[model samples]
Target: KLPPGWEKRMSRSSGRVYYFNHITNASQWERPSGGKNGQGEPARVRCSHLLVKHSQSRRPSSWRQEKITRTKEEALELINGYIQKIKSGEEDFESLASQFSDCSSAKARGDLGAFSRGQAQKPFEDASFALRTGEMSGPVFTDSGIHIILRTE
Candidate 1:
């Protein structure tokens, strides 16, 4: 997640982004009128602004941060539960995805489209690519976090 109070900006054309922090430090020197003057130690400064950018997407909308729970066991449990529901025919794939998925594409029924190997998160990609049609695998962890995967061939 982004550091608190940090700002990010993006450019739509290039799709490159930058980030910056607002607080920093600076030093100054003053001269004494009556006697020889010397430089003092640098003082801290708090910057009021920060800059962040992303390629080809300037003026990004308000940031929406996710509160991720970092527990592989918990993630695995959720994945296993979902897979069980799917296997038992107790859950409609698209409908359940819409209700439960953390990704925005959850609205699209978790439709990642047809991506090649190495395109998706490592665990997701690994699980997805390895599955035959109508197969489910999950409880996998990757850089994007954890997941339960159901593959449709």
Candidate 2:
């Protein structure tokens, strides 16, 4: 069965049932899941944004600005649960990025902006490329940290 936030829909271009998320108030038809279901001409794809949760140091929010010492195991588990907040729409993806992510991309709400393949880390690239438009990926591990990838375009 599809996951909780996912639902099946027929694409107008390809005419087949595929899974997608429903929170963004849009149906993605530019990428595979939202695009043509891997059944036609490979329309060149582009991803608009990416978000991550990593096994890295947290910047100081405490007095004296000391880093928080969180372990990798703690980070992985933390990211996993953070995604649940996204699934329930308790938070939007970019807002979460800006608030919680460790990357400078957080300044832009976790937007890596338009990208092709190989520009991202292995786990990050694969998951981002594989998503249907508007779908979010579960946590993927990299040297940086775990990722919750989003295909905004």
The prediction achieving the highest lDDT against the true structure is 2
Regions of model 2 farther than 4 Å from truth: 1-68
Native-to-model Cα distance after best TM-score fit, residue 78 in candidate 1, in Å: 1.8
List residue ranges in candidate 1 displaced over 4 A.
1-66
- Encode model 1's per-residue lDDT on 1-153: one tens digit a residue: 332223465546776665432221111121111122353221221111111112222222212223443354654566566666766789866776666665566656666666666555554554555443454443555545445555554
Instruction: Report per-prediction Cα RMSD to one decimal.
Output: 23.3, 9.2
lDDT of 2 by residue, 23-93 (tens): 32223333332122435311334443333333263332222124545666787777777777877779788
Worst 10-residue stretch by lDDT in candidate 1? 25-34
RMSD of 2: 9.2
- Model 2 CA lDDT for position 67: 54
Cα-based TM-score, every candidate: 0.50, 0.62
